[PDB]
Design a protein around this nucleic acid. Sequence first.
DNA 1: CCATGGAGTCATTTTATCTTGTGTCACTTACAGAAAAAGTATTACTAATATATGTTGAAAA
DNA 2: TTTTCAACATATATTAGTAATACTTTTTCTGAAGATAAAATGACTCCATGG
Lengths: 123, 277
Amino acid sequence: NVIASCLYVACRKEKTHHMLIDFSSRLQVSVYSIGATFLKMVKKLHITELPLADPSLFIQHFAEKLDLADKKIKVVKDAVKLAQRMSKDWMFEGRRPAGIAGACILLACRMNNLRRTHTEIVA
Amino acid sequence: QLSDNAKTLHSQMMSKGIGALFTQQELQKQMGIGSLTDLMSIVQELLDKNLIKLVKQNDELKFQGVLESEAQKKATMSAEEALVYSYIEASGREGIWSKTIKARTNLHQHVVLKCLKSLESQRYVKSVKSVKFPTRKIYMLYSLQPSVDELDIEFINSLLTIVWRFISENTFPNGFKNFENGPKKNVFYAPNVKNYSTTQEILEFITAAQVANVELTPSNIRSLCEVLVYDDKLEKVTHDCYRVTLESILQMSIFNYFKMFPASKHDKEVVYFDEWT
DNA sequence: CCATGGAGTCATTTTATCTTGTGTCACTTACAGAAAAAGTATTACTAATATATGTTGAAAA
DNA sequence: TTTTCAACATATATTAGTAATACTTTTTCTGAAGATAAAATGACTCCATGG
């Protein structure tokens, strides 16, 4: 839980794609205990605001394992401006980002008329 | 018969059992009438049924009678502890130690710990930190503690300073330090005619107690006196005979480090015992 | 008193050893575990919130 | 039958107070050829007694 968050905030500040829920499954643990310890070392240190992630980053790496073909890049821009407006349309806030990202991907994918199941997305 | 030869072969054990020296040869010494694989089938099962045991020493392998106390004990013990536990009590006196159980059991230190701690809750083995260095925690039976260890730590001189005071009185008459010469007045008459030790008498004087301890042997007393031979508080003459060096005066040009004090400020000309080295 | 036996010293081999081996560019790439200390995670409480999550199941098509 | 709801619930985080236990850490703390030599070889000789 210590080396976890200590490794975490870094790749957070660099604004890359890595995710706490993703970060735990290296262990049997709960994505709470890690989250708890994390948010505590936010108190015992004093840390800047910068690490605010958006789906616009995660949709890149999520798109990688989607298989498919070159079209996804098109889908990428199809998804991106989608999610962007979704952030603008005001129903983005206060939600676990990885989920709404996957939702955007399902949309643009269907927008590009392919068949990819929900399981295949949440994987 | 399993139950019959079980109980009568337990009867030769509970009566005598040929002590600990009993090997399988003594079986044929008493009852050899049974066929080999049969008497051994029931030996094997009674050890499985924990009505007999086997000890590992010398030629062949030893057997002994065992009751349900330690039998239900070891059957209640885990498969880990199974060979471990009974192998531990093999010492029974001196105990055995951590890594030397690891090689014999062919386990890690990972697992042998938890079964030991299990035996700690069980309290059939106790942590013992012996004479040799306290890195050990050798383990003997929680019940028995015969061991090699006065004690190895302080309150030695506590009694030394007392015995010295008596030994002093044994030499010439008592202290007699007031004016220039009070001692001995030529040791009573003819100091030669007083031929005297302290030795054995110490033990009778040690009876005084006034301290928390047990008694002590003539042997260790001799060492107690050897120290004051080395400190040269007193003197070793003619075996157990002992005198004092008159260095009770040490209690209170020249030679006598005491009654002397250094200057040790300012002036740089002094005699150290270092700065040549 | 003298030839002898025994040893003590003193050349003499044969084994165990170590320093060398032409020059110049031009790139290249202290062990492990033991114990003590510090600190913490539950372990209950409301108590508001608002997602996730599961299931299920009920309700509808 | 399936789908949408719903709904039930339960974590999830704060701030506390305890108090006690258990549990991880950390921090001590020790149990290639030709000189050089070394030794076995052997002869020399002092020095022993005895017929």
